[PDB]
C-alpha cells in the first residue's frame, strides 16, 4: 500500500537507481513494495532485497554499537552521572533496528519462504532469516534472548542442511551462509570452537571444488573464501 500503486517493474527499476544513489532506505522500501506484489523474486531481485536491508540495518548496528559503548562507559567506576539521555537514545536506535529486523522477517514469513521451492531461493531466504534474528540477538538482553538465538540457529541449520544436499561447496550462497553461521557461533552462541571448525571445513571443501569452475565463478567463490580465512586469522 505504501508502494501499492506502483508497478512491480518500476519498483525494481527504482531500487536499482536508489542503490546507485546510495539511498538504501529508499532501496529497501522499493524492494519491500516489490515483495508485497506477491510474486516470487528472481535471483537478481533477491540480491536487491538483501543488499538494501543489509545497508539499512548496517547503519543502525554501527550506531547502536557506538551508543552502547558510550552507555557502558557511563556505567563504570568513576563515571559522572549524565542522566537518562544515553540510555534513551540507545533505546531509540535499538527500537528502530528491531523494527527493521521485524519488517524483513515479516517479508520472509509472508510469504517468501513458503513459496521458495528451489534450493537457491529457499537457502537464500533461510540465510536471511538467520541473519536478521542474529541482529535481533546482538541487542537482546531480556526474557526472549534465548528464543531469538534459537530462532537464528534453527533458520541457519535448515539452510545448511538444504545447501549441503542441493548445492556445490563453492556456491556463493552456500559459502556466505556458512560464513555467517560461523559468525553466529562465535559472536552470538559463545561457541568459538564450532565457529572455527565450520569455517575451516567450509573453506577446505570449497578449495577442493574450485577445479570445476569457470574463471568467473572461481572469482565469486574465492572472494567469500577469503572472508572465511580472514575470520580464522582473527579467531586463532
Amino acid at each position: 500500500g505504501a508502494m501499492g500503486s506502483m508497478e512491480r517493474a518500476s519498483l525494481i527499476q527504482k531500487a536499482k537507481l536508489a542503490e546507485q544513489a546510495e539511498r538504501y532506505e529508499d532501496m529497501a522500501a522499493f524492494m519491500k513494495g516489490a515483495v508485497e506484489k506477491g510474486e516470487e523474486l528472481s535471483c537478481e531481485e533477491r540480491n536487491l532485497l538483501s543488499v538494501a536491508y543489509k545497508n539499512v540495518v548496517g547503519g543502525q548496528r554501527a550506531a547502536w554499537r557506538v551508543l552502547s559503548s558510550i552507555e557502558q562507559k557511563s556505567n563504570e567506576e568513576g563515571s559522572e552521572e549524565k542522566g537518562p539521555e544515553v540510555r534513551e537514545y540507545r533505546e531509540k536506535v535499538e527500537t528502530e533496528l528491531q523494527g527493521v529486523c521485524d519488517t524483513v522477517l515479516g517479508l520472509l514469513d509472508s510469504h517468501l519462504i513458503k513459496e521458495a521451492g528451489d534450493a537457491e531461493s529457499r537457502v537464500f531466504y533461510l540465510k536471511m532469516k538467520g541473519d536478521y534474528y542474529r541482529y535481533l540477538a546482538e541487542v537482546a538482553t531480556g526474557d526472549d534472548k534465548k528464543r531469538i538465538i534459537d530462532s537464528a540457529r534453527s533458520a541457519y541449520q535448515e539452510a545448511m542442511d538444504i545447501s549441503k544436499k542441493e548445492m556445490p561447496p563453492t556456491n556463493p550462497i552456500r559459502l556466505g551462509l556458512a560464513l555467517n553461521f560461523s559468525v553466529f557461533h562465535y559472536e552470538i552462541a559463545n561457541s568459538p570452537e564450532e565457529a572455527i571448525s565450520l569455517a575451516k571445513t567450509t573453506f577446505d571443501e570449497a578449495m577442493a571444488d574450485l577445479h570445476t569452475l569457470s574463471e568467473d565463478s572461481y572469482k565469486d567463490s574465492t572472494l567469500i573464501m577469503q572472508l572465511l580465512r580472514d575470520n580464522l586469522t582473527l579467531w586463532t
Partner: peptide, 7 residues
C-alpha cells in the same frame, strides 16, 4: 566479517 551482495 559476515557476507549479506552477489554478482
Amino acid at each position: 566479517x559476515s557476507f549479506x551482495x552477489f554478482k
